Design a protein around this ligand. Structure first.
Ligand SMILES: CC(=O)N[C@H]1[C@H](O[C@@H]2[C@@H](OC[C@H]3O[C@@H](O)[C@@H](O)[C@@H](O)[C@@H]3O)O[C@H](CO)[C@@H](O)[C@@H]2O)O[C@H](CO)[C@@H](O)[C@@H]1O
Ligand SMILES: NCCCCCCOP(=O)(O)OP(=O)(O)OC[C@H]1O[C@@H](n2ccc(=O)[nH]c2=O)[C@H](O)[C@@H]1O
Ligand SMILES: [Mn+2]
Length: 272
């Protein structure tokens, strides 16, 4: 097979996004015949240079996930990616740890296939334009740049939350993400710091292409704003050296291969 073209000729641009209708994954699976068990897909007519693992931090967000799958699967295939979907389900009912789950995703997906690109996406963010590439670039990529909840612009210029993409080398260079941001807030800013402290800069599509929708939702219990976040982001340069991939442990409790995604249920513990 020849290499796929540099830019996909299948993209249609702006799309209409809605979250007020029910979603039936069995139907979605039928609508997406070429997506194999575990939510895997690669174009059959050409070889994609983008071997992407999409990592979603998760717990009790099945409804949002259904919307995510319904909308992203068609987009990822049009982008001609060799990809896999991984939902990292946090076992238990103790304080949520978004970034630690993301690290588990990176490590576990690598055991599946030689992925060289990682897209980290919150479960409730849907891209509105398929020209917003869900793959890696020469520099870390911020994808959800113009979310409706922020007035279709960045909340601040160093904002790196929501959806982003790091190549395997970029991720390894920053020792992955921090493992000690329990509860809401700051871990995305810590990650931004790690990238800068390792000589990188943020790459972003323009504001129109980067338009993204956030599914309105209320506060989840067990992910209360972390009071130590402001203090933690002030010391990233020092703490990233020993807190991240090189200090990670967890226990996978179960791996489920669903038609549209692989769900890894994992015990990431509590604060130490
Ligand atoms: C640490 C934290 O809670 N981060 C969350 C972030 O919070 C906002 C962020 O603002 C940074 C910018 O604030 C401007 O006023 C100006 O100073 C800019 O130079 C600066 O970069 O941090 C402040 C406190 O540091 C916080 O009060 C703001 O709300 O918001 C995003 C979006 O919700 C979170 O993803 C992030 O974790
Ligand atoms: N008035 C509405 C206030 C809602 C404020 C709640 C904070 O909202 P956001 O900043 O969107 O963060 P969030 O959506 O709660 O967390 C981000 C991401 O973590 C994941 N997440 C978080 C908490 C939880 O219980 N389960 C889960 O899966 C999910 O992928 C989510 O999209
Ligand atoms: Mn949200």
């Amino acid at each position: 097979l020849p290499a796929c073209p540099e830019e996909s000729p299948l993209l249609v641009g702006p799309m209409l996004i809605e979250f007020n209708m029910p979603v039936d994954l069995e139907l979605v699976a039928k609508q997406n015949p070429n997506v194999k068990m575990g939510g895997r897909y690669a174009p059959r007519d050409c070889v994609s240079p983008h071997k992407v693992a999409i990592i979603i931090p998760f717990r009790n967000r099945q409804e949002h996930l259904k919307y995510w799958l319904y909308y992203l699967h068609p987009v990822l295939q049009r982008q001609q990616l060799d990809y896999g979907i991984y939902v990292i389900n946090q076992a238990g009912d103790t304080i949520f740890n978004r970034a630690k789950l993301l690290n588990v995703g990176f490590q576990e997906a690598l055991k599946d296939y030689d992925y060289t690109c990682f897209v980290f996406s919150d479960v409730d963010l849907i891209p509105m334009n398929d020209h917003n590439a869900y793959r890696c670039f020469s520099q870390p990529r911020h994808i959800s740049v113009a979310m409706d909840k922020f007035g279709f612009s960045l909340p601040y210029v160093q904002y790196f939350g929501g959806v982003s993409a790091l190549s395997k080398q970029q991720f390894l260079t920053i020792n992955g993400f921090p493992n000690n941001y329990w509860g809401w807030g700051g871990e995305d800013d810590d990650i931004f710091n790690r990238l800068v402290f390792r000589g990188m800069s943020i790459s972003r599509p323009n504001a129109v292409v980067g338009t993204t929708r956030h599914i309105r939702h209320s506060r989840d219990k067990k992910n209360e704003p972390n009071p130590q976040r402001f203090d933690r982001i002030a010391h990233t340069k020092e703490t990233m050296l020993s807190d991240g991939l090189n200090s990670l442990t967890y226990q996978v409790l179960d791996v489920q291969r669903y038609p549209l995604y692989t769900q890894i249920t994992v015990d990431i513990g509590t604060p130490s």
